[PDB]
Subunit: 269 residues, 2 copies
């Protein structure tokens, strides 16, 4: 049985993303170049079934944003209808971009200037991962919501594996969000217990009965930059050491997966 | 001008790697499956110049091991002689696999059993990133050599970029070593100053005048598992935030690089 993966994909280029602007809840479309960019992506990741075999895909999660949903269609173009029917696509609000608040639409340079004029960052420079965004999200808020996504996904993965099924789940979302996502997948940042009303409640971010909700004891958030680079159309491959869904890991993935019988990993413990 | 990348590739499958055995200085060849594995990889990475353009490759570093060297030839089969003449290949002893010492050739379960019989790991289970290997390397020793290779690589990157050249450097090495490499690339583990005689001296690990030696002030080593997965023939993409060689980053790399005019990244600071 194949080791499960969660394969994260940033939406294609939008106008703001190309220009360095922070795009959160603003619902921009893919630019023409962005479209072609995701069309060629899907083509390249499905080519001959070596990197991604549509038979092994169980779930595809998507941020509600247009740009992300557009990317789903475009990347999945090489699939047949038969292939598409076996796959569940779930819209999940937990997957949105960091809510930029006051900073929506701005450039870094501008954010710094705006904050400076407000008396902020007097001792150290702004750092979104620590500080979050005025009238937008703190690092804890996005850590939390991403953690519930992750736990849902890992839970599907465990059930699938335990059923003897291979399972590739995809996530199409955003630049800050996915870097964040991948950072906590493999253990960066800090563990915090779920205490406040927000930290405990079911905010109902998706509507799909076949995706069990995972009620978290605790969650993860970052306090600093994880140092990931993720351009539009960038892909990350998240997964597991020693076939153990308890040892989440970031995969340095080559163009094709080895069958378990041909894999090269040391044993656990 | 394009952001430089250090593209790390684990050697193809060997008989020991396939079976879970620790392969350090033992100089195994690729299995036939391994060869085919890296022939197909090279083809897939050079396919249409979108992921890797031979034009942009300046340096290829390789561990001295046979398996790594074999992989270099195999991955580069798609190249013309003209293309290969513009690329320098540098054998670097600093890029070898962790020296497993007493554990060479063994399996993890076997390592644990041997250590337990010696009275070790009485309070917590063996962890190589903290503990290293009996009559092999400490984590600090491999941290050190890897740090020297990185420093030399980032050095070339900076020079090439400052000369207005793109720069893709490849590194072909090993499972533990590469994960370790990527881990320190982007900031995991701990900074330690170079104090002891080993920590300061030039061990002369490669022989190529065109590669400047970098005399380190301090270096990095891990103290725990960075949680990367890296099969035989796996590939990671290391790089930089905001085109600043001062901000090393791991890239979640899609099938193709965007021209800087098409890239989607927030400004720095």
């Amino acid at each position: 049985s194949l080791t499960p993966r969660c394969i994260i994909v940033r939406h294609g280029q939008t106008e703001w993303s190309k220009s360095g602007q922070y795009t959160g809840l603003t619902d921009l479309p893919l630019t023409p170049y962005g479209e072609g960019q995701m069309l060629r992506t899907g083509e390249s990741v499905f080519r001959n079934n070596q990197f991604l075999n549509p038979d092994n895909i169980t779930y595809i999660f998507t941020s509600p944003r247009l740009r992300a949903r557009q990317t789903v269609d475009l990347v999945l173009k090489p699939l047949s209808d038969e292939q598409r029917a076996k796959i569940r696509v779930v819209v999940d609000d937990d997957l949105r971009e960091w809510e930029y608040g006051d900073y929506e639409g701005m450039l870094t340079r501008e954010i710094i200037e705006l904050r400076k004029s407000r008396g902020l960052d007097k001792e150290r420079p702004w750092n979104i991962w620590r500080d979050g965004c005025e009238n937008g999200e703190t690092t804890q808020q996005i850590g939390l919501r991403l953690s519930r996504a992750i736990a849902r996904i890992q839970n599907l993965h465990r059930k699938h594996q335990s059923e003897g099924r291979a399972s590739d789940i995809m996530v199409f979302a955003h630049g800050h969000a996915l870097r964040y996502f991948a950072a906590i997948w493999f253990g960066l940042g800090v563990q915090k217990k779920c205490e406040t009303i927000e930290e405990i409640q079911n905010v109902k971010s998706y509507d799909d009965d076949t995706v069990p909700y995972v009620k978290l004891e605790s969650y993860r958030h970052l306090v600093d930059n994880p140092c990931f680079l993720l351009d539009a159309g960038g892909i990350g491959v998240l997964s597991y050491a020693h076939h153990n869904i308890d040892e989440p890991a970031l995969e340095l993935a080559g163009p094709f997966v080895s069958p378990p019988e041909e894999e090269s990993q040391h044993g656990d413990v």
